[PDB]
């Protein structure tokens, strides 16, 4: 199952939920979210890695 924008945020804050999303500093690198979840299907670990605390 490949999920794309619009619904992707709704998928977020549910798998992630509760805590926020990690954001330190810009410091695009061309592999952010859409070519990782919309272009190709992504598992739960990739979505989890965008959480803040865990």
């Amino acid at each position: 199952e490949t999920l794309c924008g619009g619904e992707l945020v709704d998928t977020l804050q549910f798998v992630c939920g509760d805590r926020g999303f990690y954001f330190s500093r810009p410091a695009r690198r061309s592999r952010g979210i859409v070519e990782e979840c919309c272009f190709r299907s992504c598992d739960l670990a990739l979505l989890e890695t965008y959480c803040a605390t865990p």
């Binding site: 490949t2 794309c4 924008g5 619009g6 619904e7 992707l8 945020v9 977020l12 999303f21 990690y22 954001f23 330190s24 695009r28 952010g32 979210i33 859409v34 919309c38 890695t49 965008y50 959480c51």
Partner: protein, 787 residues
């Protein structure tokens, strides 16, 4: 006959070539003389053709200057048979100058056709020519714009028309007027002599006129008899010439075998032709190119092509009509740079192509630079074979490779092709065949509307989809092609369904349509390329159910008898289903009661009797902004009636004479479950009156008083033509005139007939006639009484 064959030929621009006719006797063809402008009369008094006798096809004269009498040039011209009629005519003379008289005293008869004379300001002696004696038909002539219009029969001032007696209708009259032979026509050297006939009425044979052609001689041009040898020689002469290829059928040397007949190599007979069996068309260069409708006009009726065809249409149904009768091509087929070719459907009946002559590169089918080409054929059913050769497919932007793959799988040329024979990246660049089926969930129909709902579909990125497109149209029969002309197929756009994350089906309901029809519907997706993920469904045929039919058309009722009324009508404009039957109601129309209180005896005695890239770009722009935002943001760690069946007419009996009747007509296309009957059509019809109904029946009873007062009591015809408005009384006394009186309905009712007072002494009479709606009836018997 001493002369030459003399094939038909024309003279123009001078009179020199006219001398070529000096050594001729019988013309086997048509003569056409036109455009003599530098001509003078004195140059034509020294020219004559006494040897010329017989003209086969027809004769045309136009714009002749100088000629005044044709008796010199054509002294002995006998008969214009009209074997080849110039549009039902055998002689056309138009726009003559200085031509004053006909001169042709030697024209007796024309076998078929008529004459056309027009715009001859000088021609005269037209009132002394008998066309009935000459031509068997005189109703087709058209002779106007001549000098005569602006009885003895004579051609010229010195030559008569040789007026034959009524017996010699076609035999002909000699110098003494005696009838000639039956085969003799118009004139004869000796009366009743077939050998001495100047002309042959039916057929000619070795100086003798005969009615028919005995075998082995066949009827040649319906004018002579020619054997098989000469007819076959003429056919061979045409065979190695440019043509009228002579064939023999029904003992006739006809220029072509008629419908359903085939030329046989062994014998000149026209055998029955196998099936449609039209023809075979050749190609010396084997390369005739089709540029437009006009170039394909000469291809009408061609089936077998003995060469190669190269289509180049720089442009619809026109080529559909011209083509579609072709089956096999001996050479190769090429289609090159045809802009207005949507599909090769028109090229229907093909099943094999030999390709003996090969396109350079050893190719049998060569398609190149075809832009709008979208389909080749309906390969699911249509059969095509290739005997040998290779295929070429380059620069065909709208033919995806599925059709090319079906090419060799149907034609059996799997190994016949080589690498690069079919281009990969140049064909079907705009064609988006993605062979993703769509299934319709359920469909329901009503007499006015029909509902459509199909299964949902989503490309991998649900934002790519940009609505559906529903195509529909009316399908006459069960088959239809999805590729019509470069039109039709009315379309409606569908908003994409909302992502339900159950599952909603897209669905669509039409708006208005024709009940009881066959509708072809199919749905096509509309997505934006990044790959292509389109989708389409098979052509679904739906049948809208029936409803109340339309009203009957043209209700006409006639009266044939005093009790019989004939009724005829037409089927309704909208049958809306197979019409089961018709319902006919007839109701006796009550007569106008007003006549019962109008005294018509006074004044008023008269009595009536009866464009797209922008939306895709907007969608892609929205999507590419969403992706940029997501990339930047995230970060990892009742009445009498009748049931008429299958009939359009009825006869109704049991109706009183001169009685009005209202007919209520309905059409019912259903019989048992509450017949759906249309709203009725109404018509008022009345029978004719009875002849004896208006006649008074009953002797007149008269009562004489002391003061010569007479009371008249006459029994009215209780069954009149409807009713009696008044009674007319014609009473006459001896020695007096027939005085007249009118007794109204009220006068008859209250006076019990009539009450006349103050009668002069003498013998009176009493004659009374009833006036029904039909008219006056019959006067009563004269009651003679002496007062």
């Amino acid at each position: 006959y001493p002369g030459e064959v003399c094939p038909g030929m024309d003279i123009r621009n001078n009179l020199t070539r006219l001398h070529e006719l000096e050594n001729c006797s019988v013309i086997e063809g048509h003569l056409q003389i036109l455009l003599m402008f530098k001509t003078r009369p004195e140059d034509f008094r020294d020219l004559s053709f006494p040897k010329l006798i017989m003209i086969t096809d027809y004769l045309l004269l136009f714009r002749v200057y100088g000629l005044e009498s044709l008796k010199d040039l054509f002294p002995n011209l006998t008969v214009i048979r009209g074997s080849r009629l110039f549009f039902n005519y055998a002689l056309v003379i138009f726009e003559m100058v200085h031509l004053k008289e006909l001169g042709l005293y030697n024209l007796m008869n024309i076998t078929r056709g008529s004459v056309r004379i027009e715009k001859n300001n000088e021609l005269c002696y037209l009132a002394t020519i008998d066309w009935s004696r000459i031509l068997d038909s005189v109703e087709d002539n058209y002779i106007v714009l001549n000098k005569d219009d602006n009885v003895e029969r004579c051609w010229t001032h010195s030559h008569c028309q040789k007026v034959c007696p009524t017996i010699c209708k076609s035999h002909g009259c000699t110098a003494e007027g005696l009838c000639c032979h039956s085969e003799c026509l118009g004139n004869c050297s000796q009366p009743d002599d077939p050998t001495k006939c100047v002309a042959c009425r039916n057929f000619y044979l070795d100086g003798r006129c005969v009615e028919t052609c005995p075998p082995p001689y066949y009827h040649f041009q319906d004018w002579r008899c020619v054997n098989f040898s000469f007819c076959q020689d003429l056919h061979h002469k045409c065979k190695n010439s440019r043509c009228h290829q002579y064939v023999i059928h029904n003992n006739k040397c006809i220029p072509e075998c008629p419908s359903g007949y085939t030329m046989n190599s062994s014998n000149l007979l026209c055998t029955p032709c196998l099936g449609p069996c039209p023809k075979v068309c050749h190609l010396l260069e084997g390369e005739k190119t089709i540029d437009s409708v006009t170039s394909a006009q000469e291809l009408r009726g061609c089936t077998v092509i003995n060469g190669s065809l190269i289509i180049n249409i720089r442009g619809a149904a026109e080529l559909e009509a011209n083509l579609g009768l072709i089956e096999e091509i001996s050479g190769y087929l090429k289609i090159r740079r045809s802009y207005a070719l949507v599909s090769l459907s028109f090229f229907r009946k093909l099943r094999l192509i030999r390709g003996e002559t090969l396109e350079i590169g050893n190719y049998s089918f060569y398609a190149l630079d075809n832009q709008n080409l979208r389909q080749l054929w309906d390969w699911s059913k249509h059969n095509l074979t290739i005997t040998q050769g290779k295929l070429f497919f380059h620069y065909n932007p709208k033919l995806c490779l599925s059709e090319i793959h079906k090419m060799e799988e149907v034609s059996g040329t799997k190994g016949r092709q080589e690498r690069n024979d079919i281009a990969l990246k140049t064909n079907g660049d705009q064609a988006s065949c993605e062979n993703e089926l769509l299934k319709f969930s359920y469909i329901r129909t009503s007499f006015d509307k029909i509902l459509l709902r199909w299964e949902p579909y989503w490309p991998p990125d649900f934002r790519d989809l940009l609505g559906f497109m529903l195509f529909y149209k009316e399908a006459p029969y069960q088959n239809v092609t999805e590729f019509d002309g470069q039109n039709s197929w009315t379309v409606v756009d569908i908003d994409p369904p909302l992502r339900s994350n159950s599952q909603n089906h897209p669905g669509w309901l039409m708006r208005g349509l024709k009940p009881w029809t066959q509708y072809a519907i199919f749905v096509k997706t509309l997505v934006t390329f990044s790959r292509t993920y389109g989708a389409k469904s098979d052509i679904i045929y739906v049948q809208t159910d029936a409803t109340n039919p339309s009203v009957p058309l043209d209700p006409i009722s006639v009266s044939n008898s005093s009790s019989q009324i004939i009724l005829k009508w037409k089927p309704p404009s909208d049958p809306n289903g197979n019409i089961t039957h018709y319902l006919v109601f007839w109701e006796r129309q009550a007569e106008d009661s007003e006549l019962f209180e109008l005294d018509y005896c006074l004044k008023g005695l008269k009595l009536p009797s009866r464009q797209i890239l922008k939306e895709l770009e907007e969608s892609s722009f929205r999507k590419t902004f969403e992706d940029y935002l997501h990339n930047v943001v995230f970060v990892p760690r009742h009445r009498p009636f009748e049931k008429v069946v299958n009939k359009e007419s009825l006869v109704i009996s049991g109706l009183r004479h001169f009685t009005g009747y209202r007919i209520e007509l309905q059409a019912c296309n259903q019989d048992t479950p509450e017949e759906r009957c249309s709203v009725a059509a109404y018509v008022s019809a009345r029978t004719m009156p009875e002849a004896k109904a208006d006649d008074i029946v009953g002797p007149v009873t008269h009562e004489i008083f002391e003061n010569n007062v007479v009371h008249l009591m006459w029994q009215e015809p209780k069954e009149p033509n409807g009713l009696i408005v008044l009674y007319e009384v014609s009473y006459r006394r001896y020695g007096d005139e027939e005085l007249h009186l009118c007794v109204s309905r009220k006068h008859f009712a209250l006076e019990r007939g009539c009450r006349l007072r103050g009668l002069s002494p003498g013998n009176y009479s009493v004659r009374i006639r009833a006036t029904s709606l039909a008219g006056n009836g019959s006067w009563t018997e004269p009651t003679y009484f002496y007062v």
